[PDB]
């Protein structure tokens, strides 16, 4: 399993909705998505960096072709950070 990551093993739909449910269970404010950085909006290769901010605090940012891809990727990043399956996590102890 080491290589194949969480969202590569397990599939999800409406990850933004899943995140909303999760942190509403955790009793925190509903965040808003805001494009932090932009490049090539009119260009054929748009690039957006979208951050998901709650109560004036950021949890995750996500790159993306479009704003929708960027925000769903940011939701994915925040879900990874909350579930503890970040790529920078403690290796498995043997």
């Amino acid at each position: 399993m080491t290589g194949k990551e969480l969202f590569e093993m397990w599939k999800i739909i409406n990850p933004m909705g899943l995140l909303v449910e999760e942190l509403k269970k955790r009793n925190v404010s509903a965040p808003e998505s805001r494009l932090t950085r932009q490049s090539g909006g009119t260009t054929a290769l748009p690039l957006y960096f979208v951050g998901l901010y709650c109560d004036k605090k950021l949890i995750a940012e996500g790159p993306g072709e479009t704003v929708l891809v960027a925000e769903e990727e940011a939701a994915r990043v925040a879900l990874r950070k909350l579930y503890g399956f970040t790529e920078n996590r403690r290796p498995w102890n043997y």
Partner: protein, 67 residues
């Protein structure tokens, strides 16, 4: 690590870290060719080499509180 780094002058102490590596594979390298050719002096020569090569895997790293 994600939030900090420790670098030596030049290298770190023995007691601070412990890098552990396991051996996985011993092989002869794929056949490398050594050809020497010079021009219009019938100087043409070749040789084959298969250098040995060893594969390790870093299994774990841990740091000591000593500092």
């Amino acid at each position: 690590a994600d939030n900090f780094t420790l670098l030596g002058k030049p290298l770190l102490g023995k007691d601070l870290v412990r890098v552990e590596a396991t051996v996985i594979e011993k092989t002869e390298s794929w056949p490398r060719i050594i050809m020497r050719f010079r021009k219009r002096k019938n100087f043409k020569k070749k040789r084959i080499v298969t250098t040995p090569q060893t594969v390790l895997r870093i299994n774990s790293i841990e740091i000591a509180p000593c500092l």
